Subunit: 82 residues, 4 copies
């Protein structure tokens, strides 16, 4: 117990300047526990999809999720590998 | 009509499960725009991320059928 | 004995080319740490990116076999 | 007149190298169709994979600029030979 766990994060961003800048600044801050990042623009929809795999602790996934959800034009779904 | 979907699959590392997932994703390949496979050998599991552009019938059939494979969990999110 | 390698694969969309690439990569799945597939439908082609951690002879073997497949182009970059 | 290109980028974990690659890839975001980042912490390195659809000026600019960042190694491959 108390070990880091795997989590999957899917982020859907509206692909304007501000929204993308804030998501990027955040993920830079948390890059330590990010094991994988995939960014796929959906230009047809002016949106971008980002998939993340993290291996991290409770404090950290919670901090990241809370912060992403405070960014305008960003939806995030967080799930543990379990 | 078609819209974008994100599918996340978590597979337990069993020969049968991988085979069945692969067969399904093969049958549905025309709708898949991206596929990322990331093994988690530490946890005897794999993660698969997919992006599709397809309709309700198709995403419903694929998700439903993935979810019926022993050792597989699936989550589907419309892009919106 | 083991090192990281990156493989980029470009595959012309022929039923057989796809099948043989998949069959080959299945043989080497133990070594594969990441696989990303991105179809390019407007060119009838698909891109595969792979990261492997394996020995020199294994990455030599896989690269050699991939290169022999009609419609497949493969580039191998060691991480160092 | 725009063509598909694949880039593989290998970066060492330096504040400088990371930030230089990132600034550069920000400038070229319009034509990037996929970006995958995979760190390899065993080696203190990161791998970036890119697919772009872009013109001649732009892919030469990007690969040329990437090619001259210390701690970066880049390979650019056209989709069609």
């Amino acid at each position: 117990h108390m070990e880091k766990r795997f989590y999957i994060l899917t982020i859907v961003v509206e692909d304007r300047e501000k929204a993308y800048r804030q998501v990027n600044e955040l993920l830079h801050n948390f890059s330590e526990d990010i094991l994988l990042r995939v960014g796929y623009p959906v230009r047809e929809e002016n949106m971008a999809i980002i998939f993340l795999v993290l291996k991290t602790d409770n404090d950290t996934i919670g901090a990241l999720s809370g912060k992403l959800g405070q960014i305008s034009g960003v939806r995030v779904k967080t799930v543990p590998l379990k």
